[PDB]
Design a protein around this motif. Structure first.
Motif, PDB file in Angstrom:
ATOM      1  N   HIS A 141       0.649  -1.559   0.236  1.00 17.08           N
ATOM      2  CA  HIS A 141       0.123  -0.074   0.030  1.00 17.08           C
ATOM      3  C   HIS A 141       1.007   1.992   0.048  1.00 17.08           C
ATOM      4  O   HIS A 141       1.283   2.000   0.571  1.00 17.08           O
ATOM      5  N   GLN A 142       0.505   2.454  -0.966  1.00 16.23           N
ATOM      6  CA  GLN A 142       1.692   3.324  -1.238  1.00 16.23           C
ATOM      7  C   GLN A 142       0.979   4.781  -1.331  1.00 16.23           C
ATOM      8  O   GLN A 142      -0.549   4.421  -1.877  1.00 16.23           O
ATOM      9  N   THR A 143       0.811   5.853  -0.524  1.00 16.08           N
ATOM     10  CA  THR A 143      -0.492   7.240  -0.623  1.00 16.08           C
ATOM     11  C   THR A 143       0.476   7.631  -1.021  1.00 16.08           C
ATOM     12  O   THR A 143       2.026   8.108  -1.550  1.00 16.08           O
ATOM     13  N   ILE A 144       0.256   8.317  -2.420  1.00 12.33           N
ATOM     14  CA  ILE A 144       0.500  10.024  -3.572  1.00 12.33           C
ATOM     15  C   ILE A 144       0.095  11.396  -2.894  1.00 12.33           C
ATOM     16  O   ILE A 144      -1.642  10.987  -3.097  1.00 12.33           O
ATOM     17  N   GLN A 145       1.054  12.283  -2.888  1.00  6.22           N
ATOM     18  CA  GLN A 145      -0.431  13.396  -2.403  1.00  6.22           C
ATOM     19  C   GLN A 145       1.214  14.382  -3.130  1.00  6.22           C
ATOM     20  O   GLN A 145       1.340  14.969  -2.835  1.00  6.22           O
ATOM     21  N   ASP A 146       0.019  14.377  -4.536  1.00  6.31           N
ATOM     22  CA  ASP A 146       0.509  15.449  -5.253  1.00  6.31           C
ATOM     23  C   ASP A 146       0.960  16.688  -4.433  1.00  6.31           C
ATOM     24  O   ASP A 146       1.445  17.438  -5.482  1.00  6.31           O
ATOM     25  N   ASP A 147      -0.541  17.812  -4.473  1.00  7.80           N
ATOM     26  CA  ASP A 147      -0.775  19.128  -4.003  1.00  7.80           C
ATOM     27  C   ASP A 147       0.299  19.238  -2.827  1.00  7.80           C
ATOM     28  O   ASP A 147       1.199  19.997  -3.302  1.00  7.80           O
ATOM     29  N   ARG A 316     -11.120  14.466  -0.399  1.00 10.37           N
ATOM     30  CA  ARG A 316     -11.683  15.828   0.390  1.00 10.37           C
ATOM     31  C   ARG A 316      -9.947  15.828   0.480  1.00 10.37           C
ATOM     32  O   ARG A 316      -9.267  17.031   0.863  1.00 10.37           O
ATOM     33  N   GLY A 317      -8.883  14.896   0.903  1.00  9.63           N
ATOM     34  CA  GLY A 317      -7.687  14.725   1.238  1.00  9.63           C
ATOM     35  C   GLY A 317      -6.452  14.904   0.232  1.00  9.63           C
ATOM     36  O   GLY A 317      -5.677  15.597  -0.188  1.00  9.63           O
ATOM     37  N   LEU A 318      -7.064  15.006  -1.216  1.00  9.47           N
ATOM     38  CA  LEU A 318      -6.181  15.690  -2.382  1.00  9.47           C
ATOM     39  C   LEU A 318      -5.569  13.917  -2.392  1.00  9.47           C
ATOM     40  O   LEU A 318      -4.287  15.008  -2.750  1.00  9.47           O
ATOM     41  N   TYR A 319      -6.058  12.861  -2.747  1.00  9.52           N
ATOM     42  CA  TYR A 319      -5.051  12.019  -2.690  1.00  9.52           C
ATOM     43  C   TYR A 319      -4.955  10.503  -3.458  1.00  9.52           C
ATOM     44  O   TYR A 319      -6.124  10.394  -3.590  1.00  9.52           O
ATOM     45  N   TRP A 320      -3.449  10.023  -3.829  1.00 12.36           N
ATOM     46  CA  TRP A 320      -4.001   8.559  -4.375  1.00 12.36           C
ATOM     47  C   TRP A 320      -3.550   7.156  -3.375  1.00 12.36           C
ATOM     48  O   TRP A 320      -2.157   7.492  -2.843  1.00 12.36           O
TER      49      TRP A 320
END
Lengths: 439, 49
Positions: A141-147, A316-320
């Motif tokens: 599991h990996q998350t990405i927050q571009d903004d 809402r959190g703007l992530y993938w």
């Protein structure tokens, strides 16, 4: 949101064996005299190792200005496992895999008089079955927050490279874990004494070094290749043979270096002394004495059931969020030859095998058991037979004949025990078989 | 003595085997290599070790 750090020292997690600055300053005439003329040596010693957790630094000329970042470099790596050639196809449906083998029978002499009342007697064929099951189900599991990540870069190329680094790292982790699991298979197989161990650190010659191990490997490969087969190279003690093209030798880097430096260098006609199997190189084993492993192509029973990736987005959190699911079954076959070349200290007896592992007899029947002792030395050990069913009237003879009492109902356990330790300190190796009662 | 004891012993064993094989197939024959003590001859392609 403002994360800051204070008074972080340059030397955070370093333990210096000796002080380089003090060594340079003192010890006149020593090997450190070369660095005496270097005027700016203390700063180089302080900074050249590397800095973790930097802080804003004002330049010396104008205190108001701040020194900035000059160059940004992104490091990326790609990894894969070298054991991927040992896998098989995929099974989409089902969980358990069955394996059946049939052994050979025994010869009887010709007796016409005895053949009068034994025409319709039965001789049970020797068959052995074993099962493999699915045992690996994992995900990454990996998350990405571009903004939120956009503020850490000033160039779109670097931003995109750093973004793709995580996607690459997911698959790198998958490959690394697969390789570790495949190595764990061999380590676990050795941990239970299921390998046929061969010691390669006892030369019998005055100068037996530099050739004993390679001689042992060549001899073992030829013995496996011998057409008539043998029961001494598998954990099921069944008469079987292998082929030269199907023999794979997993080797250690240290042992390969030893071979190349010693044997292959100072010897013409290297084809007469090179290894016989297909050589695959790994970074050593986790076992204490393991040096090499010779197996058959059918030894590995690794299959893959699922390999998929799914993505979700939190707006809402703007992530993938990325999930990579891997489902696999990892197992090895006991019917294939498996030799472990070990250069340490091993117990005298590694295992005891009872030929019928599972049996079902009536309340008045009898059974015959055979014990195969896997010993690392020429010494011969004696087995002791015992039965732990519990009911009275059930006893096992020394040769291996088990008889069942007329009235009894419980599962029986037959044990063959070998003592390898000294007196007043037992060291028992026990082989077990299970017996059920037909009526 | 012991073919596995040293490399010299293996060389001596090879020497002895080669000498015996050469003198087995001598054209005139010999009676020193059979239990019947009969003058007989062997051939190089009919010798199995």
């Amino acid at each position: 949101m403002r994360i800051t750090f204070n008074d972080v020292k340059t030397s955070l997690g370093i333990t210096e064996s000796y002080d380089i600055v003090n060594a340079i300053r003192n010890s006149q005439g020593d090997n450190f005299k070369s660095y005496v003329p270097l005027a700016t040596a203390n700063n180089v010693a302080e900074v050249g190792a590397g800095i973790l957790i930097n802080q804003t630094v004002q330049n010396d000329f104008i205190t108001s200005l701040v020194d900035r970042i000059g160059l940004v470099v992104i490091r990326q790596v790609s990894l894969n496992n070298p054991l991927k050639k040992f896998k098989k196809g995929q099974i989409p449906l089902g969980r358990t895999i069955e394996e059946i083998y049939t052994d050979i029978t025994k010869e009887k002499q010709y007796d016409a008089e005895e053949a009068e009342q034994k025409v319709f007697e039965r001789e049970m064929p020797n068959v052995k079955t074993l099962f493999h099951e699915r045992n690996r189900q994992g995900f990454y599991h990996q998350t990405i927050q571009d903004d939120s990540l956009k503020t850490a870069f000033v160039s779109w190329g670097n931003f995109e490279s750093f973004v793709s680094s995580i996607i690459n790292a997911i698959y790198n982790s998958a490959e690394v874990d697969e390789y570790e699991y495949m190595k764990l298979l061999v380590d676990n197989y050795y941990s239970k004494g299921l390998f046929t161990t061969v010691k390669i650190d006892e030369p019998t010659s005055s100068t037996g070094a530099l050739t004993e191990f390679v001689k042992k490997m060549r001899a073992t490969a030829r013995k496996l290749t011998l057409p008539q087969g043998s029961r001494d190279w598998n954990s099921m003690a069944v008469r079987t043979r292998s082929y030269m093209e199907d023999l794979h030798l997993i080797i250690d880097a240290d042992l390969e270096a030893e071979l190349d430096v010693d044997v292959l260098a100072k010897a013409f006609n290297m084809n007469r002394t090179d290894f016989l199997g297909n050589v695959t190189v790994i970074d050593g084993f986790a076992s204490t004495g393991l040096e090499a492993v010779l197996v058959d192509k059918d030894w590995f029973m690794v299959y893959d059931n699922l390999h998929k990736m799914e993505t979700v987005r939190n707006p809402r959190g703007l992530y993938w969020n990325y999930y990579y699911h891997v489902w696999q079954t990892l197992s090895v076959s006991r019917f294939a030859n498996a030799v472990a070349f070990v250069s340490g200290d091993v117990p005298a007896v590694t295992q005891v095998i009872v030929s019928p592992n599972i049996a079902a007899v009536k309340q008045g029947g009898q059974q015959q058991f055979t014990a195969y002792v896997r010993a690392t030395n020429a010494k011969d050990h004696k087995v002791v037979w015992s039965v732990e069913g519990g009911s009275t009237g059930t006893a096992i003879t020394g040769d291996g004949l088990l008889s069942v009492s007329g009235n009894e109902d419980n599962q029986l356990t037959v044990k063959a025990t070998v003592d390898i330790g000294t007196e007043d300190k037992p060291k028992l190796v026990v082989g077990e078989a299970v017996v059920s009662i037909r009526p």
